[PDB]
Design a binder for this molecule. Structure first.
Ligand SMILES: *[C@@H]1O[C@H](CO)[C@@H](O[C@@H]2O[C@H](CO)[C@@H](O[C@H]3O[C@H](CO)[C@@H](O)[C@H](O[C@H]4O[C@H](CO)[C@@H](O)[C@H](O)[C@@H]4O)[C@@H]3O)[C@H](O)[C@H]2NC(C)=O)[C@H](O)[C@H]1NC(C)=O
Ligand SMILES: *[C@@H]1O[C@H](CO)[C@@H](O[C@@H]2O[C@H](CO)[C@@H](O[C@H]3O[C@H](CO)[C@@H](O)[C@H](O[C@H]4O[C@H](CO)[C@@H](O)[C@H](O)[C@@H]4O)[C@@H]3O)[C@H](O)[C@H]2NC(C)=O)[C@H](O)[C@H]1NC(C)=O
Ligand SMILES: *[C@@H]1O[C@H](CO)[C@@H](O[C@@H]2O[C@H](CO)[C@@H](O[C@H]3O[C@H](CO)[C@@H](O)[C@H](O)[C@@H]3O)[C@H](O)[C@H]2NC(C)=O)[C@H](O)[C@H]1NC(C)=O
Ligand SMILES: *[C@@H]1O[C@H](CO)[C@@H](O[C@@H]2O[C@H](CO)[C@@H](O[C@H]3O[C@H](CO)[C@@H](O)[C@H](O)[C@@H]3O)[C@H](O)[C@H]2NC(C)=O)[C@H](O)[C@H]1NC(C)=O
Ligand code: CL
Ligand code: CL
Lengths: 426, 25, 426
């Protein structure tokens, strides 16, 4: 007569894209739409029991989250888990819910290993995956003549969820699975100045197609040093792996978009540097249902969660929880419609997998693996104004690169430089 | 610190190496 | 009136040094000695509740073990946990018991990260630690003039606890913490022939002091190929990181000790190869209490566990569980003796730490970090017979290398070859 949904997310820390202050109202919106739909679970009253994935210091935890999962499992026996989104929170909870035969839905947990559904059985990811970033990079290389060698630089903060490691792992593994080109990689520490000579030297020795996963300021400083050392768009292209657009404002207003601008008298040098720099991000959903969802999310979070949802790419995570939840209720209702129960985890999961769906994020396709296909945008500088704008768009389901507003990807040489220089790297 | 050694104990951070020197993966 | 000890180990799989078929009788011996001692917990009846750390396939599991820990914790509220011994089993259980404020004792879990006691609080290791291997290697290098460069080759089987990775991590991190020399490393796959050209080439380009953590046969085959390619004891020294002596028989009988002997007509070639090879193992305890313990362990395991305890270095793990359990009962009794309770985890733990103790393994020192100091033997070939025998011994608490039975470590040149060649590696 009612469905129990267990949530394991950050209930107090609001710094995460999947924090409850931001996912909670998106889930309330989805529950309210289930109530108003007589074709989704007619008569059922879907209840929610919450559990915090964060430890005593407030950050998501490989210990708090699995404990919270056990507490909710024995206290409420839920039919489905929601979250966590942190990789190190989601992995132990994922293995528990796989063993419990309970479906797990999350718009976080994008790590390569969560994709091994032989272990993470009945785990369905409705947000981005880092292997899907490898799909985009693959198409980018095929559609640009780079079939030899790339270099990847990544840096994390000690004690975090290692976002850049997992981003780079997804890119690295998928790209070599599909292209088998030489992908050199190097980790650094952003606050450690010792690494910048090593990095700059490694840039001019290990690649010309260069991906950097780092903070905006680290990517900026790395660009300034590359200009100061004479590395320009004629030989080098620097992709910033900024999937959440941290180095850019939201697509709503704040025209124009300038990541090189900082107000330290270096902005003039930074613009000429960023002439060699392109930014890879998630794609902002276009559909007007998204914008309406954003307005309702902001209202409901300010009312019931005392939180202010700013605009930005990070909002695709609460939108994907929203969409994932509706996609699950559809599947349960379909499982009930053919004689199943709310605990037929495998039947429910297979109805959700290899399936297209329409949600506030627009068209969303769960692939055969149970992971949502992920669309990416490519930002580039207009050499006239100097501002960055989307010039290429990647559809994850069809793996197509489509030009955007008839724009041209800027090249100082008129075309992309070769991924290997003239007479070797020497 | 180290690029390969010291990174937590979970099979999630041992799916590619990627800081390590390996002939597999 | 009674003390509850929770055990999380392999209750069914008997392939592990810390399997219950082997640790269970050692614990029964220790409980029987607590009962017969009126100075250890007088009147208390130490109870034991078991939990299997292995999954459905029988191997130790990063899911079964933490789940089992939760079951025992809420059903029995034990005052202490025993095990797990697998690294991936022990890490999640360790973070649970740290959070539960409950002490944990194990002779397994030797990984570097378990040594971070800020996270693994109240975790006491009474068996070996892989950083202690790094101590022995440090002393070996100082007492031999190697202060420049070493190479480390290691291989694991996909899906195991990665024993060689963690051994090499402990060695790598501690050695560079103390000597800051260049430690090159390379992982291979034992069954993959593509790697043996790569390894042999890396041997003759990345080091002359060469440590190999692998199976006996892989180490043997690598030696055969090094001889075939003309790598002899004049320039190279190959240490096999065989801490449990898997490539050697037990120290009880089976005289003599021949690891290069296999019966494939290659044994003639293997002996000349192994002239460049030395084997690093844990130290067999000397004291006669150990031999009496071994006899009693074998009897009790065959009687109550239907298991046959063969002789060998792996028996130091059940012996250390034994010793750690008695070392804990002392601390509880001392905590009770000064007004504490059996749940004063931090008081009990600090009585155990920075403390020397006498057990069936002889002298055992728990260091300031809560980890037992580990003694190592070094085996070497007698050039006359070709058999291997202990020639050096390392006391972990004093960090001294003492020669053994007036033996001399064999060198084809009369002294150790230089860790760096003449005019570089080119
Ligand atoms: C990224 O690439 C994906 C791969 O192609 C795109 O998926 C496609 O999405 C479109 C719509 O968004 C979808 O079209 C049809 O889907 C239904 C299933 O086949 C079909 O029944 C529909 O047809 C009905 O409605 C139309 C009017 O819309 C009528 O004219 C018809 O007579 C019929 O009544 C609809 O045409 C494709 O099937 C789907 N392709 C695949 C392979 O899934 C994504 O849309 C694209 N995303 C973006 C943002 O570009
Ligand atoms: C590895 O090195 C360790 C570090 O040196 C050694 O530890 C030493 O172990 C010895 C005994 O094994 C220990 O000796 C004394 O320990 C007591 C504490 O100080 C002390 O009270 C003892 O003295 C009593 O007994 C003797 C007879 O044994 C009498 O003559 C005395 O009058 C007294 O009544 C005992 O002498 C050291 O203290 C200890 N040193 C440290 C720094 O801990 C390990 O033994 C060694 N292991 C191996 C296998 O070599
Ligand atoms: C909400 O979550 C934030 C990110 O998860 C968190 O920010 C970060 O806070 C940690 C402290 O927990 C900082 O780091 C330190 O972590 C360990 C634990 O003390 C130390 O040993 C390290 O040396 C390091 O100093 C991070 O630097 C910090 N990161 C950022 C980007 O701010 C917030 O603190 C959390 N807030 C609340 C209220 O829970
Ligand atoms: C007792 O434990 C033994 C070691 O923990 C175990 O041996 C090993 O068994 C596994 C199977 O679980 C073999 O490996 C395979 O692991 C996964 C899971 O199927 C596969 O995907 C891999 O490709 C791989 O084939 C190991 O190779 C094997 N190792 C050894 C040294 O034998 C025993 O099977 C366990 N026995 C019982 C009764 O539980
Ligand atoms: Cl989380
Ligand atoms: Cl175990």
């Amino acid at each position: 007569s009612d469905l129990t949904v267990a949530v394991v997310l950050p209930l107090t820390n609001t710094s995460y894209p999947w924090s409850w202050a931001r996912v909670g109202p998106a889930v309330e919106l989805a529950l309210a739409r289930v109530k108003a739909r007589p074709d989704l679970l007619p008569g059922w009253t879907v209840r929610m029991v919450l559990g915090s994935s964060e430890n005593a210091a407030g950050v998501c935890s490989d210990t708090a989250a699995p404990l919270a999962a056990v507490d909710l499992k024995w206290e409420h026996s839920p039919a489905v888990f929601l979250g966590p989104g942190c990789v190190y929170s989601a992995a132990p909870v994922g293995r528990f819910t796989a063993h419990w035969r309970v479906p797990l839905l999350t718009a976080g947990a994008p790590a390569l290993g969560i994709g091994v559904k032989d272990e993470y059985a009945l785990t369905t990811r409705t947000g981005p995956s880092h292997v899907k970033l490898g799909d985009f990079v693959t198409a980018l290389h095929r559609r640009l003549g780079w079939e030899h060698q790339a270099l990847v630089l990544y840096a994390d903060r000690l004690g975090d969820d290692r976002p850049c490691f997992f981003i780079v792992e997804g890119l690295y593994m998928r790209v070599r699975e599909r292209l088998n080109i030489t992908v050199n990689h190097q980790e650094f520490v952003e606050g450690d100045p010792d690494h910048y000579p090593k990095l700059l030297r490694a840039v001019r020795r290990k690649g010309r197609v260069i991906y950097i996963c780092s903070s905006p300021d680290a990517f900026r400083n790395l660009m300034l040093l590359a200009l100061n050392a004479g590395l320009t768009g004629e030989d080098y292209v620097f992709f910033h792996l900024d999937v959440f657009g941290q180095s850019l404002k939201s697509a709503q207003g704040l025209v124009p978009q300038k990541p090189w601008e900082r107000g330290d008298g270096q902005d003039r040098s930074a613009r000429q540097a960023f002439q060699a720099a392109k930014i890879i991000t998630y794609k902002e959903p276009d559909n007007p249902e998204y914008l309406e969802f954003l307005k309702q999310l902001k209202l409901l979070a300010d009312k019931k969660f005392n939180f202010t949802v700013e605009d930005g790419l990070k909002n695709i995570i609460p939108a994907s929880f929203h969409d994932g939840l509706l996609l699950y209720v559809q599947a349960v209702t379909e499982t009930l419609a053919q004689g199943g129960t709310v605990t037929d985890g495998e039947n429910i999961t297979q109805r959700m997998w290899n399936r297209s769906f329409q949600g506030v994020t627009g068209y969303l396709k769960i692939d055969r693996n149970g992971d949502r296909d992920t669309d990416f945008s490519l930002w580039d500088m207009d050499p006239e104004t100097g501002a960055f704008r989307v010039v290429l768009n990647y559809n994850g389901t069809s793996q197509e690169l489509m030009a955007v507003s008839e724009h041209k990807l800027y090249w100082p040489l008129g075309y992309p430089p070769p991924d290997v220089p003239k007479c070797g790297f020497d | 610190r180290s690029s390969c050694f010291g990174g937590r104990i979970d099979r999630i951070g041992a799916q590619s190496g990627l800081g390590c020197n390996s002939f597999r993966y």
